[PDB]
C-alpha cells in the first residue's frame, strides 16, 4: 500500500508579486486597490448640498441669482464648474481661507443685528445686481451712501455676549473714477477700519478703471472678522463701506467642500470622490486623491493582488506515464475540490482520495485573519487641484501631497509583498507538518519514497488508511510484519 | 563511503545588519547609498543653462550686465553665488513666488505689445544702469516720466485673444524725496492699479530715503500679473509707473532652478544635485536633499549594505585534526570556487569535490530578483535651504522636509534588514533542501553522521557518487549489501 500526500491546484490561477519573484502563480487572489467609480454621489449618510450655479462665497454674500441656499446646512458642499457670479463685480483677498472657513463651518446661518447707520442712506444697489425688474445688491451686505449731501464718520459697535464666535463679512468699494467717490461719498478718499479687542483691519480704498464687468468698472473687496465671546466689534468708516447686515454662526464639525460635476442619486456610500462615490471595503483606491468620509488611501498602483490561496503547480504532462502520479513535491492535484490538503491511497482494495480538514482549516483561518487586518476618516483637508498659479504656498501643498502619495504607495507595495511571501511560506509549512505527522504516525511501518508518498510495508485495508488519516493508527499491531517485509527481503 | 554536503565561504566577507544582530558576516554585499559625487553637472539629457553672474529675476527684468539671457529656454537654471545686480536698486514683494513661477515656466520669451502711453515721456533711465557710456534701464521695463509739465491719468488696456497665459511684469517707483517725486511725476502722490476681470493689484507709492545703492536712494517694487485667455489687462496710473513693454510667454513643464557653484562638463547623467551629478543606479543617496531629474531618495544613513551572498563561516582551526574536516553544519568551504553548494566524497578510489548547480542557480536567481525590486522623477519642488529668516512658512517647509527624510530613512532601514534576513533564511533553506533531497535519495543505504555527512554502507565507485549527485541513484541494487553492513555488524 502507498499513501501520497498532496495539495490542490486550480486550472487557471492568479499571478502575484513577492519579495524575490515578481511573478508567482497562486490559486486565488484578491484586489486591494479600487480603480472604479459609479460616477454618482450618494446622499447618504452625509448631507450633500448641490451648489448648482453658485459658489460658496456667492451664497455667503447673497447673490440674487440664487437665494435658495440661504440658511442652509451641509456636510459636503458640491461646487460645479458651471457656477458663475451675476452681481456687482467683487474680489476677496485671501479668498481660499474664507472659502475654507465657510466650508468647515457648514452653516450659512445668518442672524440680523440692530446696526444703526446715522446720517447715511442704506439699501444701496446697482444695475449689475438686478433682483428681478429693479436694481438690487447682495442680500447679506448693506451699501451705505451719502444721505442728502453729507457722509458722516460712522462709529458703530456691537458686543458678543453669546457663547459662540460670530463671522462678520463686510466690504470696501473701489470706485472707477473720482467723480464717483465724491458723488456717492462726499469725501475724496474713504477709509474703513473694523477692529476688535485683539485684531484690526484697516482698508484705504482705490480709484481706477477696472475692466468692464456687468456694466460696472468698480470693484468690491470682501473682508471678514471673527468675534469671540467677550469681544466687541467696532466699525469706523469715513466712506467706501459695504457694511454687514448681521453675523453668520460659526461652528466646528466635519463639514467640507468639493468640486465635482458628478450627479447625485439616492444610495448609501461613506466615501465620496469628485469622480463619484466609491466603496471603502478595499484598503487602497486609485480614483482620486481628493476624498471625503471614510475613504481608502490613495496609491499610484492601478492593481495590487493579495494572495488568498497557495502556490499553483498544475498538471502539465511533464512526467508520469499512464497515471503513475506522486505526492506534494511533484505537482499539485486538480482533482481535489474538497480541501487544500489531502491523501491518495492505493491498497489491495483499490485507490481512493480524501481531504485533510484540520490543516486546510488552519491555513484558511490564518489567511482570513491576515486578510482582516489588511482591510481612516478624513473630512476637511487641503486643496489638491489648482486652477491658478500662485507660488510658494501652492508648491508647498503639492510637495506635501506628493510626499504622502509616494510614502503610502511604498507602504502598500511592501505590505502586499510581505503578506504574499508569508502566505506562501505558511502553506508550504502546513504541508510539511502534515507530512511529518504522517511519518511519526507510521514509524518503521513505512518508508519515504522521496516523492511525497509513504510506502507501507504491511498490507492493511481501507480501515487502516482511515486510521492513518484520523491519527488513530496503532503501529505495534503491524511492527512484526512491516519489519519482516522491510528488512528481510 | 562518505558523502558530505557543504556551502562555500570567502576569506574576507562584508558585515551586514539584519533584524536579529547588527553585525553578521556575509560573503558578498552591495552598497545601497550613493555617498559620492563627481563634482560636475552634466548637460545631457537635461538642458542646463548656466546663469553665470545673474539671478533669474535679473535676467527676467533685463539688467544690462547680461542681456545674453534674452529669449532663453532651460530645463534647469543654475544660480551661482557670484550673481550680482548692476542696475537700479529694486525690490520684489514676495520674491520667492515670482522666482518659482519663472523657473517652472522654463522660458524667458518676451513678446512686445503695442502699448500707447500718450502724454508721457517714455524710455526713462538712470545712471545706476549704465549701458556702456550712457544711462539706461531694464530692457523689459519702460520708465515713464512727465512730458513737459503734465502727467495724465494713463488708462491702457490689452486683451487676451490668444490661447496661452501672458505674464506681465511691471513696477512702481518709490522716490527718495518729494522734490524728486514732483519733478518726475508732477503729482504729490502717485497711484498704480493693474487689474483683470477677476483680480486687481493697487499700489500707493511712499517716499523715503532708502540706503544709498549704486547712486540712487529710491526703490522699484516689481509686481507681476497673469492674464488668461479671454481676459483683459487694464493699467490705470496717476503716477509712479514702471510700465511693461510686453509679456512673457507662460509654459507648463518640467523646468526648475538650482543654486550651485559646481562646474558644467560635457557628460550624461539623469540626476543633478548642487554638489554635482550622481549616478541613479542605487535607490538611496546621501549627497544632498535638493535633486533634479530621476534621482535616488535622500537618506540620513551614510552606508547601507544589502546581502547578496549568505553567511560566511570560514575555517579558523578550532576543531578537526590533520585535515579530517567535513560537513556544512560545522563550517564552510573556502576551497569551493565553482558553486555555492556541493558535495565532497571519500570512497575507495580517493576523494573528490563537485558542485550542485541547481540549488546555486536557484539561490542566485532569487537574490537577483530581490535585488531588481530594490533598484522616481521629481523636477520642481519646494526650497530646501534658506539664506534669510522669514518665519511660519520657512519652518513649515523645514518640518515637511525633515519628516520626509526621517520616514524614508526608516523605510530604508526596514527594507535592508528584512531583505538581509530573508536572504540568509533562504540560503539556509536551500542548503537544508539539498540535504533532504540527498537523504531521500539514500533510502536505508546511508545514515547521517550529524555533522552534515552521510556514511554509505555499501561500496560503489565514482559513478555511484555521480549518480547520487545527478539524482539517478537506484537504491534497490544496493539494499542487500547496505542492510547487511548496517544492521548485522
Amino acid at each position, epitope marked *: 500500500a502507498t499513501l501520497c500526500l498532496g495539495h490542490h491546484a486550480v486550472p487557471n490561477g492568479t499571478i502575484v508579486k513577492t519579495i524575490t519573484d515578481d511573478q508567482i502563480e497562486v490559486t486565488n487572489a484578491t484586489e486591494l486597490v479600487q480603480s472604479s467609480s459609479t460616477g454618482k454621489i450618494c446622499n447618504n449618510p452625509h448631507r450633500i448640498l448641490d451648489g448648482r450655479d453658485c459658489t460658496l462665497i456667492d451664497a455667503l454674500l447673497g447673490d440674487p441669482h440664487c437665494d435658495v441656499f440661504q440658511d442652509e446646512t451641509w456636510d459636503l458642499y458640491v461646487e460645479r464648474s458651471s457656477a458663475f457670479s451675476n452681481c456687482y463685480p467683487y474680489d476677496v483677498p485671501d479668498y481660499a481661507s474664507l472659502r475654507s472657513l465657510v466650508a468647515s463651518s457648514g452653516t450659512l446661518e445668518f442672524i440680523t443685528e440692530g446696526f444703526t447707520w446715522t446720517g447715511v442712506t442704506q439699501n444701496g444697489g446697482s444695475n449689475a445686481c438686478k433682483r428681478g425688474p429693479a436694481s438690487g445688491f447682495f442680500s447679506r451686505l448693506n451699501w451705505l451712501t451719502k444721505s442728502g449731501s453729507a457722509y458722516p464718520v460712522l462709529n458703530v459697535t456691537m458686543p458678543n455676549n453669546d457663547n459662540f464666535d460670530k463671522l462678520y463679512v463686510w466690504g470696501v468699494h473701489h470706485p472707477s473714477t473720482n467723480q464717483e467717490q465724491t458723488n456717492l461719498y462726499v469725501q475724496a478718499s474713504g477709509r474703513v477700519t473694523v477692529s476688535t479687542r485683539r485684531s484690526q483691519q484697516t482698508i484705504i480704498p482705490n480709484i481706477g478703471s477696472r475692466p468692464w464687468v456687468r456694466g460696472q468698472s468698480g470693484r468690491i473687496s470682501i473682508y471678514w472678522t471673527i468675534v469671540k465671546p467677550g469681544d466687541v466689534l467696532v466699525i469706523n468708516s469715513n466712506g467706501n463701506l459695504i457694511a454687514p447686515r448681521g453675523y453668520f454662526k460659526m461652528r466646528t464639525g466635519k463639514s467640507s467642500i468639493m468640486r465635482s460635476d458628478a450627479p447625485i442619486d439616492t444610495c448609501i456610500s461613506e466615501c465620496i470622490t469628485p469622480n463619484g462615490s466609491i466603496p471603502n471595503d478595499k484598503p487602497f483606491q486609485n480614483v482620486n486623491k481628493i476624498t471625503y468620509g471614510a475613504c481608502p488611501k490613495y496609491v499610484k498602483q492601478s492593481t495590487l493582488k493579495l494572495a488568498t490561496g497557495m502556490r499553483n503547480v498544475p*498538471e502539465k*504532462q*511533464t*512526467r*508520469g*506515464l499512464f*497515471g503513475a502520479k506522486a505526492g506534494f513535491i511533484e505537482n499539485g492535484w*486538480e*482533482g481535489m475540490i474538497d480541501g487544500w490538503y489531502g491523501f491518495r491511497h492505493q491498497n489491495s482494495e483499490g485507490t481512493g482520495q480524501a481531504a485533510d480538514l484540520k490543516s486546510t482549516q488552519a491555513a484558511i483561518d490564518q489567511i482570513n485573519g491576515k486578510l482582516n487586518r489588511v482591510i481612516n476618516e478624513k473630512f476637511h483637508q487641503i486643496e489638491k487641484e489648482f486652477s491658478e498659479v500662485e507660488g510658494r504656498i501652492q508648491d508647498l501643498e503639492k510637495y506635501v501631497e506628493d510626499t504622502k502619495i509616494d510614502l503610502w504607495s511604498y507602504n502598500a507595495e511592501l505590505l502586499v509583498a510581505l503578506e504574499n511571501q508569508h502566505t506562501i511560506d505558511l502553506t508550504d509549512s502546513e504541508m510539511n507538518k502534515l507530512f511529518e505527522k504522517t511519518r511519526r504516525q507510521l514509524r518503521e511501518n513505512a518508508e519515504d519514497m522521496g516523492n511525497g508518498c509513504f510506502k507501507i510495508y504491511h498490507k492493511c485495508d481501507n480501515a487502516c488508511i482511515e486510521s492513518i488519516r484520523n491519527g488513530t493508527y496503532d503501529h505495534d499491531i503491524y511492527r512484526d510484519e512491516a519489519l519482516n517485509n522491510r528488512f528481510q527481503i | 563511503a562518505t558523502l558530505c554536503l557543504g556551502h562555500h565561504a570567502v576569506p574576507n566577507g562584508t558585515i551586514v545588519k539584519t533584524i536579529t544582530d547588527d553585525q553578521i558576516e556575509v560573503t558578498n554585499a552591495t552598497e545601497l547609498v550613493q555617498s559620492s559625487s563627481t563634482g560636475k553637472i552634466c548637460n545631457n539629457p537635461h538642458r542646463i543653462l548656466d546663469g553665470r553672474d545673474c539671478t533669474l529675476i535679473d535676467a527676467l527684468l533685463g539688467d544690462p550686465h547680461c542681456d545674453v539671457f534674452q529669449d532663453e529656454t532651460w530645463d534647469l537654471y543654475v544660480e551661482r553665488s557670484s550673481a550680482f545686480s548692476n542696475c537700479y536698486p529694486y525690490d520684489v514683494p514676495d520674491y520667492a513666488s515670482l522666482r518659482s513661477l519663472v523657473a517652472s515656466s522654463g522660458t524667458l520669451e518676451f513678446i512686445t505689445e503695442g502699448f500707447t502711453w500718450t502724454g508721457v515721456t517714455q524710455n526713462g533711465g538712470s545712471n545706476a544702469c549704465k549701458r556702456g557710456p550712457a544711462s539706461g534701464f531694464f530692457s523689459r521695463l519702460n520708465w515713464l516720466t512727465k512730458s513737459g509739465s503734465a502727467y495724465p491719468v494713463l488708462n491702457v488696456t490689452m486683451p487676451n485673444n490668444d490661447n496661452f497665459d501672458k505674464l506681465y511684469v511691471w513696477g512702481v517707483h518709490h522716490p527718495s524725496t518729494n522734490q524728486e517725486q514732483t519733478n518726475l511725476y508732477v503729482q504729490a502722490s502717485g497711484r498704480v492699479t493693474v487689474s483683470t476681470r477677476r483680480s486687481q493689484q493697487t499700489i500707493i507709492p511712499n517716499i523715503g530715503s532708502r540706503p544709498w545703492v549704486r547712486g540712487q536712494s529710491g526703490r522699484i517694487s516689481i509686481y507681476w500679473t497673469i492674464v488668461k485667455p479671454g481676459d483683459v489687462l487694464v493699467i490705470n496710473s496717476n503716477g509712479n509707473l514702471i510700465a511693461p513693454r510686453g509679456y512673457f510667454k507662460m509654459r507648463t513643464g518640467k523646468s526648475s532652478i538650482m543654486r550651485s557653484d559646481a562646474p558644467i562638463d560635457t557628460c550624461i547623467s539623469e540626476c543633478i544635485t548642487p554638489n554635482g551629478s550622481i549616478p541613479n543606479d542605487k535607490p538611496f543617496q546621501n549627497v544632498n536633499k535638493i535633486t533634479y531629474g530621476a534621482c535616488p531618495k535622500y537618506v540620513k544613513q551614510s552606508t547601507l549594505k544589502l546581502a547578496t551572498g549568505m553567511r560566511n563561516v570560514p575555517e579558523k582551526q578550532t576543531r578537526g585534526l590533520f585535515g579530517a574536516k567535513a560537513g556544512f553544519i560545522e563550517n564552510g568551504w573556502e576551497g569551493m570556487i565553482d558553486g555555492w553548494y556541493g558535495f565532497r566524497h571519500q570512497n575507495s578510489e580517493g576523494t573528490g569535490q563537485a558542485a550542485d548547480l541547481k540549488s546555486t542557480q536557484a539561490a542566485i536567481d532569487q537574490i537577483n530578483g530581490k535585488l531588481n525590486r530594490v533598484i522616481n522623477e521629481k523636477f520642481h519642488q519646494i526650497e530646501k535651504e534658506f539664506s534669510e529668516v522669514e518665519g511660519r512658512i520657512q519652518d513649515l517647509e523645514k518640518y515637511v522636509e525633515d519628516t520626509k527624510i526621517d520616514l524614508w530613512s526608516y523605510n530604508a532601514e526596514l527594507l535592508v534588514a528584512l531583505e538581509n534576513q530573508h536572504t540568509i533564511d533562504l540560503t539556509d533553506s536551500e542548503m537544508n533542501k539539498l540535504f533532504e533531497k540527498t537523504r531521500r535519495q539514500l533510502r536505508e543505504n546511508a545514515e547521517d553522521m550529524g555533522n552534515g555527512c552521510f556514511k554509505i554502507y555499501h561500496k560503489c565507485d565514482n559513478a555511484c557518487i555521480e549518480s547520487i549527485r545527478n539524482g539517478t541513484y*537506484d537504491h534497490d541494487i544496493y539494499r542487500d549489501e547496505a542492510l547487511n553492513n548496517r544492521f548485522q555488524i
Partner: antibody
Amino acid sequence: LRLSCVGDLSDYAFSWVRQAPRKGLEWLAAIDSVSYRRSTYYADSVKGRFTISSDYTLYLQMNSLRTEDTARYYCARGAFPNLWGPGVEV
Amino acid sequence: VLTQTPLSLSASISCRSSQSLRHTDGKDYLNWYLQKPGQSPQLLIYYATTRASGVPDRFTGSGSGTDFTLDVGVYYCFQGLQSPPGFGAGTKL
C-alpha cells in the same frame, strides 16, 4: 541518429513516434523519467523485436527491420507527445 | 481504441473511445494535435479541456468519458491512460 528535439534538462519523459508517408502517426516507444524507475513501454507491433533508445536522444538500428519501417521518426517530450521535433527520414 | 469521425472535413471533429479515458484523478486523458503539411505536429488541446498556451483561440474542445469533440492539415486525438497508447486515424481538413 537524432535531431533538434528542443525549441533544457532530462527530468521530462520522452517518446519515439513514427509517421509513414501516407499512413498517419503511430506511437512506437516511450521512456519514463527517473522518478518512476524509468519503466519503458513499447508498442505491441514493435514488441520484443524492438530497437531500444535512450538519452544522454537517438535510436539504434541493425535489427529485425523488415523494410516496413521506412518513415519519418519524431522525438517527443512529456508524458504525452507535447513538444515535437523536425524528425529524421529513414 | 479510438475512432475519429469524420475522416474528411470541408468544424467539429469527434473522437470516441471504447473505454472511458477518465482517471481517478479527475482528468480526461485525451490530447488533440495538429499536423500541418510538412511540419511537425503541434499540441492544440491537452487533457481534452485545457488549451495549450501559445495557440490561437479558434480551437476549443470538450467532452468526457468516451466522447470528445473539437488550419489546413491533419487532426489527431491521442490517449495516454493505457499501456499501449496511440493516436487516431486523423481528420484531414
